[PDB]
Amino acid sequence: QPMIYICGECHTENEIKSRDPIRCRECGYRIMYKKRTKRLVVFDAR
Amino acid sequence: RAAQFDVVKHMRQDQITNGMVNAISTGNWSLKRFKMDRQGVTQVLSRLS
Amino acid sequence: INVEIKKIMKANEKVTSDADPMWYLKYLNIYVGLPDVEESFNVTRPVSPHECRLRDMTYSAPITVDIEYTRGSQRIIRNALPIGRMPIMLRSSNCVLT
Amino acid sequence: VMGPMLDAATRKPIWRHEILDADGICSPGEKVENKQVLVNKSMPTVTQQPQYKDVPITYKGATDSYIEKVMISSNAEDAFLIKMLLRQ
Amino acid sequence: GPSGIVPQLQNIVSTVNLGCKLDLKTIALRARNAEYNPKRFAAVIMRIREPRTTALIFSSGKMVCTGAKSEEQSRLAARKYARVVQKLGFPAKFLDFKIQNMVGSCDVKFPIRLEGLVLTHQQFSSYEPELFPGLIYRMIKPRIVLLIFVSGKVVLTGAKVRAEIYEAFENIYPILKG
Amino acid sequence: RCPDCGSTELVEDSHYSQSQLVCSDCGCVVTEGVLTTTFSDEGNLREVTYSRSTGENEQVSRSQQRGLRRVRDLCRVLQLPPTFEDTAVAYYQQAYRHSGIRAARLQKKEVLVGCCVLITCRQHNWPLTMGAICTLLYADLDVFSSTYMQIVKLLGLDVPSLCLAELVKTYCSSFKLFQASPSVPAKYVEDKEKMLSRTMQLVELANETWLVTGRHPLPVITAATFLAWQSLQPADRLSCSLARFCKLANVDLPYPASSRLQELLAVLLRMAEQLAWLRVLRLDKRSVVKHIGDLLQHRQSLVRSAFRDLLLPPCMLKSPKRICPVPPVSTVTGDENISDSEIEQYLRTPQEVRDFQRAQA
Ligand SMILES: [Zn+2]
Ligand SMILES: [Zn+2]
């Protein structure tokens, strides 16, 4: 249900859903990247 | 106070750090010692290529 | 960073008051340290330059000194008093990348 | 930052909030047109409960762009910091 | 309802006006239990064994008494002091007797987690073990202040009549229990 | 409302560049074009505080400006964020409104600044001990406590509690055991993370077993860290005492820490009586320290079973047969005077009168 973020170094899936400070659950790293969207997108081969 | 004080209670830490980083970032180097100012002494590194 | 700070300290090593003499403060040695980051609860860990780019932080290292001063007795010495933080140039002696 | 509000009729987000993820921030990989909202930021009126006025981060651009990656991080001052990267 | 433990008063405070001018030096000189040290404070202290109370004289014509176990007993102590002052030669009277404060204490015989009491009632209950182990609790109906401790014993203070202390105990007992 | 239609369906919209207000109902324009600042004057932008722009900050007395300067310096030497500084100065400026606060001696104001920073930091949930700030002040702890109580009851402001886990999390880093410094043998060095986990579970056990209520937490945390450091290497550290451990750590040990450690060891023995192997091994105060691991592995069931045997101050647990005995009813005051010889007993004779005259001549 909650949103997932990827830690910038160990790539372990984390969840926040809160006003908590951004910190990796596992390591000390403090950078998080959002996951790729689930929708499809249509491109032209040109 | 009649009883002796100590200076370690007044080691103002912000003064040096601020003094430098605003000088580097702004590129203005005012110095009362020489009654002169130097402008435009730093620039943002260009990363076109 | 290696020598000229030593000379600047040498030129200003002592200070003494006219009011209430026999009290004085005297530096002994100054060190430049390695770059690090202030953690939210009064600790530090080694920091790489790229993290300083992404987080808008500044890449700097702590300047710290040992000091001698009097309070009643003249025997109070500290060894690692910080005075500030010095920005670090990349690939210099101290930078992690070198 | 609040989630995207949805039309009662279509049960889907209104056009301006098309690309927002549930957590109120844009989603990597999507395509963004002109005059759409990337971060649904609102701030209180204190300048009895505090009213919040909206100040969204809208995308202004002559041409489309694709979102490449979105970064979340915080500073020592507990400030949230969001950075986004857009591709043409 | 009550658990069979009735709060017991341990102190009363009362005052009365003597209605005449008095000399502190004369009282200190002529009375046995009188204590007077003008270098410290300009008042005389009085002590009697029945009632077990302590009281003070002031030259402006005022008297205070405290230490009794009941308000009637405090009045008895005050009237005994007034009689002593009268027979010492001062034209004193027992005018405008007033009960000022009475303290009580009680127990519930079960532990009171002060953490829970604070995190449910922070608005008027203050909890701070470091300077004071007990929890400090103020109340509006009636205007009383309490001290609640780990063992479940409670100290009650600020009342004018035992009914207030009783009803305060009844009010807090369901809070103490849960 | 649309001047042409009366309907209230106005939608804010913009064409390629023009910003405008359009009646969506009929396609009508009712307002367009905006006047804005530029970037050229952006670089010239100054700022003035509303206090400066409304006639304040000139009436600040020499003592008030000295006091707020003290607030600034005391908060900054502790490396707090600027938010803490600004909240502290705001609180003190509000507090100075009270007549009984402004008219006062200097040391009382100093301890008021101390409690001001204490409340501001508590508001942001930062754990800071009263002892350290008291030592930073030039005032004794009693006056500081008295003024802290006075201000919190004068203002009625919220006082967040000193949460235990964060105080442990701050305190733990003061242990210089985790560095292989020449002063401390490398035998005593240990990993920090598992150190914190063991200390955290011991402190949680102490909290749920009633040891922290009404009592100072620092000695309990000291006992927890010590039993942890022992239990993590029984082979050698079992022979070290609290004096030796505090000497190695260069940390002073509270005197009640020994009593808290004894009480917590008693709790540990009460827990050990349930486990099948420990209760047969017939353990003792010293040997129990090498099973804290499996005692805490299965904490919940064992402690719940032991609670069905609670913990309370030992001073009262001595099996008090009589609890708060009812005193005899002695509310009778007689009719008018139950005795009169007492007054003669409480007055001096002329001899003793003259003796008192000469006693202090
Ligand atoms: Zn990580
Ligand atoms: Zn219209």
Curated annotation (Swiss-Prot), chain B:
Localisation per UniProt entry: Nucleus; Cytoplasm, Cytosol
Residues the record lists as binding RNA: Q43
Binding site for DNA nontemplate strand: D37
Site entry: Critical in trapping poly(dT) in Pol III-mediated transcription termination: F34
Source taxon at top rank: Eukaryota
Family, as annotated: Belongs to the RNA polymerase beta chain family.
Subunit structure comment from the entry: Component of the RNA polymerase III (Pol III) complex consisting of 17 subunits: a ten-subunit catalytic core composed of POLR3A/RPC1, POLR3B/RPC2, POLR1C/RPAC1, POLR1D/RPAC2, POLR3K/RPC10, POLR2E/RPABC1, POLR2F/RPABC2, POLR2H/RPABC3, POLR2K/RPABC4 and POLR2L/RPABC5; a mobile stalk composed of two subunits POLR3H/RPC8 and CRCP/RPC9, protruding from the core and functioning primarily in transcription initiation; and additional subunits homologous to general transcription factors of the RNA polymerase II machinery, POLR3C/RPC3-POLR3F/RPC6-POLR3G/RPC7 heterotrimer required for transcription initiation and POLR3D/RPC4-POLR3E/RPC5 heterodimer involved in both transcription initiation and termination.
UniProt-recorded name of the protein: DNA-directed RNA polymerase III subunit RPC2
Organism in which the protein naturally occurs: Homo sapiens (Human)
Name of the coding gene: POLR3B
Residues of the full protein shown: 396 to 444 of 1133
Curated annotation (Swiss-Prot), chain C:
Subcellular location: Nucleus; Cytoplasm, Cytosol
Family: Belongs to the RNA polymerase beta chain family.
Disease: Leukodystrophy, hypomyelinating, 8, with or without oligodontia and/or hypogonadotropic hypogonadism: An autosomal recessive neurodegenerative disorder characterized by early childhood onset of cerebellar ataxia and mild intellectual disabilities associated with diffuse hypomyelination apparent on brain MRI. Variable features include oligodontia and/or hypogonadotropic hypogonadism.
Assembly description: Component of the RNA polymerase III (Pol III) complex consisting of 17 subunits: a ten-subunit catalytic core composed of POLR3A/RPC1, POLR3B/RPC2, POLR1C/RPAC1, POLR1D/RPAC2, POLR3K/RPC10, POLR2E/RPABC1, POLR2F/RPABC2, POLR2H/RPABC3, POLR2K/RPABC4 and POLR2L/RPABC5; a mobile stalk composed of two subunits POLR3H/RPC8 and CRCP/RPC9, protruding from the core and functioning primarily in transcription initiation; and additional subunits homologous to general transcription factors of the RNA polymerase II machinery, POLR3C/RPC3-POLR3F/RPC6-POLR3G/RPC7 heterotrimer required for transcription initiation and POLR3D/RPC4-POLR3E/RPC5 heterodimer involved in both transcription initiation and termination.
Name under which the protein is recorded: DNA-directed RNA polymerase III subunit RPC2
Species in which this protein is naturally found: Homo sapiens (Human)
Residues of the full protein shown: 51 to 148 of 1133
Curated annotation (Swiss-Prot), chain E:
Annotated tissue distribution: Widely expressed, with levels highest in the testis and ovary.
UniProt entry tagged with the keyword Cytoplasm: no
This protein's GO CC annotations: chromatin; cytosol; euchromatin; female germ cell nucleus; female pronucleus; male germ cell nucleus; male pronucleus; nucleoplasm
Alphabetized UniProt keyword annotations: Disease variant, DNA-binding, Host-virus interaction, Neurodegeneration, Nucleus, Repeat, Spinocerebellar ataxia, Transcription, Transcription regulation
Repeat region (Sequence), residues: 9-85, 99-176
GO biological process, one term: spermatogenesis
Localization (cell): Nucleus
Signal peptide: none
Full protein name: TATA-box-binding protein
Organism in which the protein naturally occurs: Homo sapiens
From Swiss-Prot, chain F:
Region Required for interaction with TBP and formation of a ternary complex with DNA and TBP, annotated ranges: 319-361
Superkingdom of this protein's organism: Eukaryota
Post-translational modification Cysteine sulfenic acid (-SOH), affected residues: C315
Annotated family: Belongs to the TFIIB family.
Interaction with target DNA: annotated span: 103-109
Name of this protein: Transcription factor IIIB 50 kDa subunit
PANTHER family for the chain: TRANSCRIPTION FACTOR IIIB 50 KDA SUBUNIT (PTHR11618:SF5), TRANSCRIPTION INITIATION FACTOR IIB-RELATED (PTHR11618)
SUPFAM superfamilies in the record: Cyclin-like, Zinc beta-ribbon
GO molecular function, one term: zinc ion binding
GO biological-process terms attached to the record: cellular response to oxidative stress; regulation of transcription by RNA polymerase III; transcription preinitiation complex assembly
Compartments, as annotated in UniProt: Nucleus
Alphabetized UniProt keyword annotations: Activator, Metal-binding, Nucleus, Oxidation, Phosphoprotein, Repeat, Stress response, Transcription, Transcription regulation, Zinc, Zinc-finger
Species annotation: Homo sapiens
Zinc-finger ranges (TFIIB-type): 1-31
Induction description: Down-regulated by epigallocatechin gallate (EGCG) treatment.
Positions of region (Required for the formation of a ternary complex with DNA and TBP): 311-317
Predominant subcellular localization, coarse grouping: nucleus
Cellular compartments per GO CC: nucleoplasm; nucleus; transcription factor TFIIIB complex; transcription preinitiation complex
